[PDB]
Amino acid sequence: DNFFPIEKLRNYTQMGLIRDFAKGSAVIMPGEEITSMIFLVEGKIKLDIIFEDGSEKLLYYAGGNSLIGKLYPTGNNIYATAMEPTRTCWFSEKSLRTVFRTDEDMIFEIFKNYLTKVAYYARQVAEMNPTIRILRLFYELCSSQGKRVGDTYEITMPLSQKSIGEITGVHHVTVSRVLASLKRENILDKKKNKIIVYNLGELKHLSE
Amino acid sequence: FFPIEKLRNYTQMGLIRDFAKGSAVIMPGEEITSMIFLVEGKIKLDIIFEDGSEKLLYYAGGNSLIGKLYPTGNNIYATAMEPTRTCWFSEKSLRTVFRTDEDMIFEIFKNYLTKVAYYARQVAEMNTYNPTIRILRLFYELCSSQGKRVGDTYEITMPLSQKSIGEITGVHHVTVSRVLASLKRENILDKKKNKIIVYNLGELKHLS
Ligand SMILES: O=C(O)Cc1ccc(O)c(Cl)c1
Ligand SMILES: O=C(O)Cc1ccc(O)c(Cl)c1
């Protein structure tokens, strides 16, 4: 929710383009290339990221005085919709120059807003041992679905690393590291249609 | 993140500070009110949490910008990994830069936006704001690979406690209880003793 509302932007809306949106209309469309900052004069906007597989995850809720800082291409596919009657002011690069030439302080208000967002998201990435969750998942899977094949358990299941990451809330880069380490230590080998457990005892132990 | 090589043209407007390998660019608890341009060298920048736990935020090299012009309320610690030359730009000294070249405002916006785009995508990937989804995904994966079809239903044989579901998915046990109760009420899935019955795989697949 609310990011360093830029309330002083209220005074410069005459220098951008007003765009009003009815409840449920898409303020940003999937694959729409936005090259404007969007000021929320009043309303509520829900902004999501759409990953390259079509999953749609919430980033934030924007309300009165919020700034959507999407002045340039980002590599994230964004989809934003109005959740009430929303009035917005759109500020292209050209119109921001007009703002800065009137009031230089506005450059620093916008820095503060971006800075608030980096501080917020970076801290959350950091806040989130998540590794134990992958071990608990393999342990529960092995102990109920695992078939004894000589001195190994086999779980017949196409469980992609993407699915492991989604189930456990573990970043896709940590999943691959955990699995590499599991293989190297002769514990578990996560192949394509099967998972092979060589050491159920140590797996149980690591997981508890 | 977007490097700002052009800021090398304006270091005479800032304060040059050199750091030896291993020395602190930013000290624990230091109040930073300057952007820090890395002319040459290499910096590791960590967040320090209130328990004393330290976590990487990023590595920075040639032409990188540390955007900490205002207090954020994170405790940050940043060390030189090699001998490093830096240029410190206060708000005043940044105003002198922008009076000379208005485009440096927008170069800094791009740098900031690249950082929000990077951290926000990571937060979004991990379903931080909709962690219930990790539960649906667990059930969906289990059913699609281990489910046996019985009329218009699937049976999975799996002793799985709510405490286990929460430990696997990183989801609070109260949310776990609420999700299992709603699944059963909506006739989607029921976990009856050691058997998971899915009545509506299609709907469970849709939700996850
Ligand atoms: O567009 C992006 O990739 C991320 C994003 C979304 C909304 C914002 O207000 C910002 Cl600064 C960035
Ligand atoms: O200081 C912070 O809280 C986060 C931070 C760290 C480094 C940076 O370059 C930025 Cl823009 C923010």
Residue numbers in the entry:
A (entry chain A): 17 to 144, 148 to 227
B (entry chain B): 19 to 226
Any passages from the paper?
Members of this family are homodimeric and contain an N-terminal sensor domain linked via a long α-helix (involved in formation of the dimer interface) to the C-terminal helix–turn–helix (HTH) DNA-binding domain.
Crystals of the ligand-free CprKC200S can be soaked with high concentrations of o-halogenated phenol acetic acid ligands without any apparent detrimental effects. The corresponding structures reveal that OCPA is bound in both sensor domains and establishes a near identical network of polar and hydrophobic interactions within the active site as described for the cocrystallized structures. While the conformation of the central α-helices (Ser-108 to Ala-142) has become identical to the OCPA cocrystallized structures, the sensor domain β-barrels have only partly rotated along the Ser-108 hinge points. This is likely due to the fact that full rotation as is observed for the OCPA-bound structures would lead to minor clashes with crystal symmetry related neighbouring molecules for both monomers. While the N-terminal residue Phe-20 has effectively replaced the previous position of Phe-19 in both monomers, as occurs during conversion from the ligand-free to the ligand cocrystallized structure, the preceding N-terminal residues remain unstructured in both monomers. We therefore speculate that reorganization of the N-terminus only occurs during or following DNA-binding domain reorientation. Furthermore, in view of the similar resolution and near identical crystal packing, a direct B-factor comparison is feasible between the ligand-free CprKC200S and corresponding OCPA-soaked structure. This reveals that ligand binding leads to significantly decreased B-factors for both β-barrels as well as the C-terminal section of the central α-helices (average decrease of ∼6 Å2).
